[PDB]
Design an enzyme around this catalytic site. Structure first.
Site, PDB file in Angstrom:
ATOM      1  N   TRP A  92       0.892  -1.310   0.080  1.00 50.27           N
ATOM      2  CA  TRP A  92       0.046   0.018   0.038  1.00 50.27           C
ATOM      3  C   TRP A  92       0.815   1.248  -0.023  1.00 50.27           C
ATOM      4  CZ3 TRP A  92       0.711   3.534   4.090  1.00 50.27           C
ATOM      5  CH2 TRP A  92       1.107   3.018   5.052  1.00 50.27           C
ATOM      6  N   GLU A 100       6.580   8.362  14.327  1.00 47.25           N
ATOM      7  CA  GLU A 100       7.023   7.797  13.050  1.00 47.25           C
ATOM      8  C   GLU A 100       7.884   8.584  12.153  1.00 47.25           C
ATOM      9  OE1 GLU A 100       6.147   4.812  11.971  1.00 47.25           O
ATOM     10  OE2 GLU A 100       4.407   4.007  12.972  1.00 47.25           O
ATOM     11  N   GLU A 118       8.685   1.558   6.536  1.00 44.06           N
ATOM     12  CA  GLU A 118       8.326   2.594   7.606  1.00 44.06           C
ATOM     13  C   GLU A 118       8.344   4.151   7.376  1.00 44.06           C
ATOM     14  OE1 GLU A 118       7.968   2.192  10.905  1.00 44.06           O
ATOM     15  OE2 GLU A 118       8.027   0.068  10.878  1.00 44.06           O
ATOM     16  N   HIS A 139       4.584   5.125   6.629  1.00 41.63           N
ATOM     17  CA  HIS A 139       3.831   5.537   8.078  1.00 41.63           C
ATOM     18  C   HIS A 139       3.718   7.134   8.307  1.00 41.63           C
ATOM     19  CE1 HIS A 139       4.781   1.351   9.581  1.00 41.63           C
ATOM     20  NE2 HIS A 139       4.304   1.175   8.189  1.00 41.63           N
ATOM     21  N   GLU A 165       7.601  -2.939  18.235  1.00 47.22           N
ATOM     22  CA  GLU A 165       6.826  -3.156  17.112  1.00 47.22           C
ATOM     23  C   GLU A 165       5.404  -3.737  17.579  1.00 47.22           C
ATOM     24  OE1 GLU A 165       6.775  -1.533  14.431  1.00 47.22           O
ATOM     25  OE2 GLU A 165       8.558  -2.009  13.210  1.00 47.22           O
ATOM     26  N   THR A 173       3.417  -0.680  18.956  1.00 44.04           N
ATOM     27  CA  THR A 173       2.879   0.191  18.230  1.00 44.04           C
ATOM     28  C   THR A 173       1.748  -0.413  17.359  1.00 44.04           C
ATOM     29  OG1 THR A 173       3.244   1.753  16.170  1.00 44.04           O
ATOM     30  CG2 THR A 173       4.713   0.016  16.478  1.00 44.04           C
ATOM     31  N   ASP A 223       1.645  -3.523   8.940  1.00 45.55           N
ATOM     32  CA  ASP A 223       2.988  -3.601   8.681  1.00 45.55           C
ATOM     33  C   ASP A 223       3.845  -4.003  10.085  1.00 45.55           C
ATOM     34  OD1 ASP A 223       2.330  -2.667   6.139  1.00 45.55           O
ATOM     35  OD2 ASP A 223       3.467  -0.836   6.461  1.00 45.55           O
ATOM     36  N   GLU A 224       3.253  -3.259  11.063  1.00 45.07           N
ATOM     37  CA  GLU A 224       3.713  -3.573  12.297  1.00 45.07           C
ATOM     38  C   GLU A 224       3.771  -5.067  12.976  1.00 45.07           C
ATOM     39  OE1 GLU A 224       1.467  -0.653  13.867  1.00 45.07           O
ATOM     40  OE2 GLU A 224       3.015   0.959  13.790  1.00 45.07           O
ATOM     41  N   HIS A 241       6.416  -6.900  10.703  1.00 49.28           N
ATOM     42  CA  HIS A 241       7.781  -6.440  11.199  1.00 49.28           C
ATOM     43  C   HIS A 241       8.199  -7.143  12.780  1.00 49.28           C
ATOM     44  CE1 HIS A 241       7.579  -2.738   8.739  1.00 49.28           C
ATOM     45  NE2 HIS A 241       7.910  -3.838   8.078  1.00 49.28           N
TER      46      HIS A 241
HETATM   47  C1  LIG Z   1      11.835   0.156  17.760  1.00 49.33           C
HETATM   48  C2  LIG Z   1      12.364   0.935  16.853  1.00 49.33           C
HETATM   49  C3  LIG Z   1      13.496   1.932  17.618  1.00 49.33           C
HETATM   50  C4  LIG Z   1      12.858   0.499  15.452  1.00 49.33           C
HETATM   51  C5  LIG Z   1      11.127   2.354  16.480  1.00 49.33           C
HETATM   52  C6  LIG Z   1      10.060   1.427  15.693  1.00 49.33           C
HETATM   53  O1  LIG Z   1       8.781   1.216  16.815  1.00 49.33           O
HETATM   54  C7  LIG Z   1       9.102   2.873  14.929  1.00 49.33           C
HETATM   55  C8  LIG Z   1       8.497   2.290  14.168  1.00 49.33           C
HETATM   56  O2  LIG Z   1       8.330   1.074  13.894  1.00 49.33           O
HETATM   57  O3  LIG Z   1       7.378   2.936  13.680  1.00 49.33           O
HETATM   58 FE   LIG Z   2       6.055   2.611  11.941  1.00 47.47          FE
HETATM   59 FE   LIG Z   3       7.069  -0.214  12.677  1.00 42.48          FE
END
Ligand SMILES: CC(C)(C)C[C@@H](O)CC(=O)O
Ligand SMILES: [Fe+3]
Ligand SMILES: [Fe+3]
Ligand SMILES: CC(C)(C)C[C@@H](O)CC(=O)O
Ligand SMILES: [Fe+3]
Ligand SMILES: [Fe+3]
Ligand code: NA
Ligand code: NA
Lengths: 327, 338
Positions: free
Chosen positions: B37, B80, B118, B121, B171, B174, B203-204, B207
């Site tokens: 996306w 972000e 990222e 975002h 992650e 968030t 996405d989170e 990740h």
């Molecule tokens: C854990 C970090 C330091 C990579 C930060 C992350 O949470 C930021 C993000 O994914 O939006």
């Molecule tokens: Fe993010």
């Molecule tokens: Fe993230």
């Protein structure tokens, strides 16, 4: 290695002074329609009317520049690869880490401002631009500064001057087409670059004072490698030669050319007193002669290239809905 | 004080040997650029005949969303936007950092591709908030500039053990946060904002899954080192990436934003507890044997911590008063309850 630690106080007094405090910094909102104003809708409308009078080829150049700015995380990582100056924790209180972080913070405004201008304009395909940005950050860059702060700072001195020239030229064109607000955007970003370039150039000046041989040798090494543009790996999912094509457009439009590259080279040679240096090592004198020297060679090659140049050659760009512009 | 490079240099070999494994087990959690996306998918279409109409509608929907929610959404967006900070974190990590800016290792490929994902975002949330007319963008921009200048100090000491544990945790944090803000957006009648938050949340999840899988593998081949690192990070406490947030007026801005996010139910100390307990289970921490005194200390600590925190935090709601209202520059110094 110890040289940069020993230069920490010097950097606080000579480099950090070129940062604008956050309170005194311009912000992207200063140059965009105000979303809380009763006139927001009219302001967007006016921006869009002005944009209609700007030709596609200028938008190709502006988009390429915006994409370059948006890859900022890549550039902070580069500075943080440099031994002696790299931020070891993410919050290091060294002059050098404070500079990297604050420079990055100033840079972040550039991509933000250009993104929203381009978004509001209605003249470009934001989704294809967004795809290009994702490819670019994913690809990274390969400018060959290794882990050297000499290479890193010499490269940055050069490249910030290049982007200063580019933005000043883009401002001139924006004003030409009747868009004063876009001219102000480009002018504001350009003023950051003039300041940043001055700061990086000052650092290298000091290094040349303390260790002329290492500095001139690194300068020659960087120039042999060539100053590779930060977004050299750009790709949009359709044009494998996107960077070459964008660069060709930028040249024809008079935003940035091989002759500007030569001008920057000769500027830095002068600013770092490279031609006037004496008592160098055998390797140092070789490097001195090479850089001195390189400018006239590139300028003549460019002159010959222009002499044999055939007629371009129109090209579709996804950034402008596959509409075509002259290379 | 700062501690750097706490991972023994011998362990560089572990991550080198895991390059192939990472291609097959970690990189698989990235989505191709063609299948991703993009922010434009969720924003008024500036080439559309109805662009102006679409902007009006976004603004009409935004009016029905309370100031409290916008405080949390702005906090989220500012976090972000500090993306350069986070890529630098990964790129100071022993054994995984990108050596050239384009290194073709699995680890560097991940870092760059994750950063690229990222980037969308912040881009999306920035333009949503800009168009909303509900927030002071100049103050938000000032906050972001302070934040990137400040960086962060989450204390992962150049260690992929500490770093990947931290990122697995954060992650997931968030994710929960975005899932809750999407749920609230829909409740306020803003379906598009719900999609914005849900897309970032998706996405989170990927990740968090990828980082969690790395630590799972590390726990398998290096159980003592991994569990000790887990206890280490929990003992320090998981620091929010934007802990140094400042807007040029509120010196306690992070605390205040956190209090609001807690009250409105976007992220709270019980979510923190849920993540801890999930990860203890996912990395089979309780199920581990073959440790090892300092490792047994670590296993004990981590398994007992969750119950301790939620005794405890519930308690401290309990003794908690009756919250005052605080102005936030992000919403033009209008006030919300802490
Ligand atoms: C854990 C970090 C330091 C990579 C930060 C992350 O949470 C930021 C993000 O994914 O939006
Ligand atoms: Fe993010
Ligand atoms: Fe993230
Ligand atoms: C020289 C770099 C790699 C720091 C890139 C820089 O030109 C980016 C920028 O200032 O917009
Ligand atoms: Fe810039
Ligand atoms: Fe710059
Ligand atoms: Na940006
Ligand atoms: Na951004």
């Amino acid at each position: 290695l110890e040289i940069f630690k020993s230069l920490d106080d010097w950097a606080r007094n000579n480099v950090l002074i070129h940062l604008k405090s956050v309170e005194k910094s311009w912000q992207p909102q200063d140059y965009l329609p105000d979303p809380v104003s009763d006139g927001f809708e009219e302001q967007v409308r006016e921006l869009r009317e002005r944009a209609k009078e700007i030709p596609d080829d200028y938008f190709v150049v502006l988009v390429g520049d915006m994409i370059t700015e948006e890859a900022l995380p890549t550039y902070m990582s580069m500075l943080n690869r440099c031994d002696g100056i790299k931020d070891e924790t993410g919050a290091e209180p060294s002059a050098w880490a404070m500079w990297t972080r604050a420079w990055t913070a100033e840079e972040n405004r550039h991509g933000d401002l250009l993104n929203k201008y381009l978004y509001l304009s209605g003249r470009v395909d934001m989704r294809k631009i967004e795809k290009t940005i994702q490819y670019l950050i994913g690809s990274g860059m390969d400018i060959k500064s290794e882990n050297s702060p000499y290479l890193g700072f010499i490269y940055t001195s050069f490249q910030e001057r290049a982007t200063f020239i580019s933005h000043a030229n883009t401002a001139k064109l924006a004003q030409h087409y009747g868009d004063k607000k876009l001219a102000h955007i480009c002018g504001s970003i350009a003023s950051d670059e003039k300041r940043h370039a001055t700061a990086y150039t000052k650092i290298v000046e000091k290094l040349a004072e303390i260790d002329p041989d290492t500095t001139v040798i690194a300068f020659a090494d960087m120039m042999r490698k060539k100053i590779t543009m930060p977004a050299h790996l750009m790709y949009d999912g359709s044009d494998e030669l996107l960077f070459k094509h964008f660069t060709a457009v930028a040249q024809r439009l008079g935003v940035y050319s091989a002759l500007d590259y030569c001008d920057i080279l000769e500027f830095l040679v002068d600013k770092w007193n490279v031609e006037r240096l004496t008592g160098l090592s055998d390797e140092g004198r070789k490097a001195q002669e090479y850089v001195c020297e390189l400018g006239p060679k590139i300028r003549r090659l460019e002159e010959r290239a222009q002499g044999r140049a055939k007629e371009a050659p129109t090209m579709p760009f996804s950034w402008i809905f596959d509409r075509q512009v002259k290379l």
